[PDB]
């Protein structure tokens, strides 16, 4: 299997990521997921409000990737490897081999955080990690 694909929707994926990297743009998070019955990544949502807001868009039936910028000095970049509690174990296993390729696609990931409930996404704990 080719695995995760970034071909279809490439422009949307990089446009969200570029918005997150830009200091002038308000948005500081983007959320990606797979298209149904496919390994092609698509943009699910994006916005402002950082980790607190982003944790509100995670879905329990999906594998998703959250790219959030976190700042008083230069910003660092978190990739949330989200696997919903209702994702089948086999698909968790297959998707696990994509994470590195996703981090390579969205250049500049500073830390990868594995998550299956919102409670795994503590802004403090992530901050101390950086």
């Amino acid at each position: 299997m080719a695995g995760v694909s970034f071909s279809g929707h490439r422009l949307e994926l990089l446009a969200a990521y570029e918005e997150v990297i830009r200091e002038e743009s308000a948005a500081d998070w983007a959320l990606y997921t797979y298209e149904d019955g496919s390994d092609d990544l698509k943009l699910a949502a994006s916005g402002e409000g950082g980790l607190q807001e982003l944790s509100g868009h995670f879905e329990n039936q999906k594998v998703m990737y959250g790219f959030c910028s976190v700042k008083a000095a230069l910003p660092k970049y978190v990739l949330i490897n989200w696997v919903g509690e209702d994702v089948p174990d086999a698909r968790k296993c297959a998707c696990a081999s994509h994470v590195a390729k996703v981090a390579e696609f969205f250049q500049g990931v500073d830390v990868i955080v594995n998550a299956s409930s919102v409670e795994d996404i503590d802004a403090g704990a992530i901050g101390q990690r950086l």
Binding site: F6, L14, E18, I21, K92, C93, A94, S97, Q107
Partner: protein, 302 residues
């Protein structure tokens, strides 16, 4: 010899390979006549071809058995994804006393690893064929619709994928496994020509042309570092002027990375020749490595 067919994993009358343990139903090989004497199975014959010096793959020509073993170790590591515990160590008879009554040829990722280390795979096909024992045996003992069987399908699919990467380019593969400083910018011994690749709805993008098949080229994109097919017919040799015109910032990053690559190619081989605007990429192009672009008869850098 195995009692269960290699293709459908069911019993019944089968043909027995003479070299390996596997067995096949005639129906499952889609045979059209009966084999005459000693029979070698498709896995053995594929391997025999892939390991013959006169018919080995371009990746195998340039690898020794030891180097390939190192790449295989990396592939084993990619197969041990989180969730694969049931296949990392041989099945204990204490957990399943009847196991040997069904599995003629056990296999696990640890054994794959040790065998790779003992340099007993002469080609990537050898390796994936040995790996498939894990799945075959899973289906036999747990059934095709088991959860574990779903995991074993994932690890055999990762295995296929990594074998293919190694075969596309061993040097690319190793540099991507180690991920040293600017690993994407290291030229390979036979350097892939640099091109403007184009996907639907995305601007022209600097890329490595890794291979051509039936009007497509397999481009590995600067910046993002993934690979995808793009039509040969809108692909152009790298130039100073872009074929058209977007998403400026990441593009400038990718350009910088490509320019580092160009500098490295100039230090490794002595040349890198930019093309005129919109020069169409051709298969097996050599223009970029010409000692004198004015005068192709001088040849290319060795």
């Amino acid at each position: 010899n195995d009692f269960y067919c290699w293709v459908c994993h069911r019993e019944g009358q089968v043909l027995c390979c003479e070299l390996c343990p596997r067995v096949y139903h005639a129906k499952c090989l889609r045979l059209t006549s009966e084999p005459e004497g000693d029979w070698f199975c498709p896995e053995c014959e594929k391997i025999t071809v892939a390991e013959c010096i006169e018919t080995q793959s371009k990746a195998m020509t340039m690898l020794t058995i030891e180097q390939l073993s190192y790449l295989l170790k990396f592939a084993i590591q990619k197969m041990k994804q989180p969730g694969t515990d049931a296949f990392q160590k041989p099945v204990p008879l204490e957990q399943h006393p009847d196991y040997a009554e069904y599995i003629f040829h056990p296999m696990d990722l640890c054994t794959l690893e040790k065998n790779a280390k003992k340099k007993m795979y002469g080609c990537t096909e050898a390796f994936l064929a040995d790996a498939k024992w894990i799945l075959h045996n899973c289906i036999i003992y747990n059934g095709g619709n088991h959860k574990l069987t779903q995991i074993a399908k994932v690890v055999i699919k990762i295995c296929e994928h990594e074998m293919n990467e190694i075969e596309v380019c061993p040097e690319c593969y190793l540099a991507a496994c180690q991920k040293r400083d600017n690993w994407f910018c290291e030229p390979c011994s036979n350097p892939h020509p640099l091109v403007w690749a184009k996907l639907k709805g995305f601007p022209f993008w600097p890329a490595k042309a890794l291979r051509d098949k039936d009007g497509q080229v397999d481009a590995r994109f600067f910046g993002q570092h993934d690979r995808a097919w793009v039509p040969i017919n809108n692909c152009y040799l790298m130039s100073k002027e872009i074929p058209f015109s977007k998403t400026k910032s990441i593009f400038n990053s990718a350009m910088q990375e490509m320019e580092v690559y160009v500098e490295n190619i100039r230090r490794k081989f002595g040349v890198f020749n930019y093309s005129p605007f919109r020069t169409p990429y051709t298969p097996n192009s050599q223009y970029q490595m010409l000692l004198d672009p004015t005068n192709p008869s001088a040849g290319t850098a060795k």
